[PDB]
Amino acid sequence: LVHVASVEKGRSYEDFQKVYNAIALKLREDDEYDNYIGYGPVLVRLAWHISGTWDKHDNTGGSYGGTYRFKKEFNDPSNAGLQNGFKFLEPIHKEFPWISSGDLFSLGGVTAVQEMQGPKIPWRCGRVDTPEDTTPDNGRLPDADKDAGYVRTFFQRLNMNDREVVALMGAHALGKTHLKNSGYEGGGANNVFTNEFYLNLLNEDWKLEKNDANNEQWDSKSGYMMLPTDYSLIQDPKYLSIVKEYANDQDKFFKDFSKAFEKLLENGITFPKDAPSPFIFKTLEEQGL
Numbered sequence: 001l002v003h004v005a006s007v008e009k010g011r012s013y014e015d016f017q018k019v020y021n022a023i024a025l026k027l028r029e030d031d032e033y034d035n036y037i038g039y040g041p042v043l044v045r046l047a048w049h050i051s052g053t054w055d056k057h058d059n060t061g062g063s064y065g066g067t068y069r070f071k072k073e074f075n076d077p078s079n080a081g082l083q084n085g086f087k088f089l090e091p092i093h094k095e096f097p098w099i100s101s102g103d104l105f106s107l108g109g110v111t112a113v114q115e116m117q118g119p120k121i122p123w124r125c126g127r128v129d130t131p132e133d134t135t136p137d138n139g140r141l142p143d144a145d146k147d148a149g150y151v152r153t154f155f156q157r158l159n160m161n162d163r164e165v166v167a168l169m170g171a172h173a174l175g176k177t178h179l180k181n182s183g184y185e186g187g188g189a190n191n192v193f194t195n196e197f198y199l200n201l202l203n204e205d206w207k208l209e210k211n212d213a214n215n216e217q218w219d220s221k222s223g224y225m226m227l228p229t230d231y232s233l234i235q236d237p238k239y240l241s242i243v244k245e246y247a248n249d250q251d252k253f254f255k256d257f258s259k260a261f262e263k264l265l266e267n268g269i270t271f272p273k274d275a276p277s278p279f280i281f282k283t284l285e286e287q288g289l
C-alpha cells in the first residue's frame with residue numbers, strides 16, 4: 001500500500017506556523033484541564049496513538065489517513081481519554097479547515113512537545129484523509145502489563161530499534177495515568193519536557209504493588225509510578241545501558257527523541273523528491289507571543 005504526501009493546496013511554512021500558534025495559544029488558555037496539567041501531555045499521546053497503529057509489513061494504519069476521526073478507532077479501548085485531545089483540536093480545525101486530519105493530529109503532538117520546552121521536532125505536511133474502510137482494527141497499540149521482550153518485539157512492527165524505543169518512552173515524563181482510562185493509578189504529574197523519566201527509573205525506590213483495578217504497577221515512596229513496560233527498561237541489560245545514557249545526557253536524549261518522534265509520525269508516508277523540506281516551527285516564546 002503506497003501513501004504519497006500531497007501538500008494542502010497553496011500552503012507553505014507560514015500557513016502551518018499559524019496553525020502551530022493557534023494550538024500553542026489554546027494550550028496556554030485552557031490551562032485548568034486535568035488538575036492544571038493542561039492539554040500538552042494528552043496531545044503528545046494522541047499523536048503517538050494515531051501513528052502507532054502502523055504495520056511495516058503491509059503499510060496499514062499510520063498517521064497518513066487521519067482515521068482516528070472514525071468511530072472504530074476513536075472508540076478503541078487503547079485510546080480511552082484521547083477524546084479530550086480530539087475535543088481540544090476541534091476549534092483549531094474549524095478555524096483552519098484546509099488542514100488534513102492526520103497533519104492536524106501529528107502537528108498537535110509536535111506543538112505540545114515544543115511548547116512544554118522539549119526539543120524541536122521537524123515536521124512535514126501532506127497527510128491525506130482516507131475513507132472509513134481504511135481505519136485499522138483495534139488491538140495494534142501496546143499492552144502495559146508486559147515485559148522487555150514484549151516491548152522489543154512490539155516495536156519491531158513500527159521499525160523501531162532499542163535506542164528508538166528507550167528514547168520514545170521518555171515521553172512518560174509527561175502527564176499521568178488515570179484509573180478510569182487505562183486501569184493504572186496515576187502518580188505525580190508534569191507538563192515540562194525533561195529527561196526525568198530515566199532519572200526516576202534509576203534513582204527512586206520502587207515497590208511492585210497491585211492497584212484498585214487489580215493491575216500490577218511499580219510505586220515509589222515519593223509518589224511516582226511506572227508501568228511494568230516502563231520498568232522493563234531497567235530489567236533488560238541492553239535497555240538499561242541506554243536508560244543510563246539518557247539519565248546522564250539531556251541534550252543526547254533531546255536529539256534522539258526528536259529523530260524517533262519525527263520518524264514515528266512519518267512512518268508509512270512516501271515523500272516525493274520535490275516535497276518541501278521539513279518545517280521547524282518557532283515557539284510562541286521565540287516569536288515574543
Ligand code: HEM
Nearest residue numbers: 041042044045048142143144168171175176177178181182
Ligand atoms: C510500550 C509502550 C507504551 C505503553 C504500554 C504505554 C501505556 C500508557 C498508559 C497505560 C498510559 C496512561 C493512560 C491514561 O490512563 O490516561 C499512558 C500515558 C501516556 N503515554 Fe504511553 N505507553 C507507551 C508508549 C508511549 C510512547 C512511545 C509515547 C510518546 C512518544 C507515549 C506518551 C504518553 C503520554 C504523553 C501519556 C500521558 C497522557 C496524559 O497525561 O493524558 N506513550 N501510556
Ligand SMILES: CNc1nc2ccccc2[nH]1
Nearest residue numbers: 172173174175176177188
Ligand atoms: C510522571 N508522569 C507520568 N508517568 C507515567 C507512566 C506511564 C504513563 C504515563 C505517565 N506519566
